[PDB]
Amino acid sequence: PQVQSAADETAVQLSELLTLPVLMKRSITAPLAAHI
Amino acid sequence: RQHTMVSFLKPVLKQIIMAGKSMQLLKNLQCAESTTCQAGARDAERKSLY
């Protein structure tokens, strides 16, 4: 979701709950770690 | 100076003083975390005396 709709609000709920570095870490490393 | 009594509070000034002393004691007594800090009516949610 992230930034891909308009009225949607959960798409940014993590972005308000989590900091951008921590959000990016959680979002990127989990699939990365799974594939590695 | 005896003049320091608040006339509007004067009828209740003694009770006020006793209550203030009691609250200062309770907050100043190392009370165990008393459950009577109910998470219910916050003092901020308590209507102020005003």
Add this chain to the structure above:
Amino acid sequence: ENQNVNLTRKGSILKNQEDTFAAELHRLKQQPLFSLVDFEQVVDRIRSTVAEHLWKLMVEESDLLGQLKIIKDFYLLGRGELFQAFIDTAQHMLKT
């Protein structure tokens, strides 16, 4: 975090409840007045959860009691008869 850097991927003590506390903090951010009581309550809940998981790991998973018993026996001379016999045997080496 420092232990999980070295420890295998054992999840957070609060695991999925971390986000719940994040939502509570977001509600606090949405609160028009800062209440120390609610903040302290949430902090204490998180603290208690983490402390309970740490205690469980230390006592059951990390056998804190065995280490304390070892320390008593050796550092605290808990095996007083053993350390007495050791002193009696090593005295000639350790008297110098």
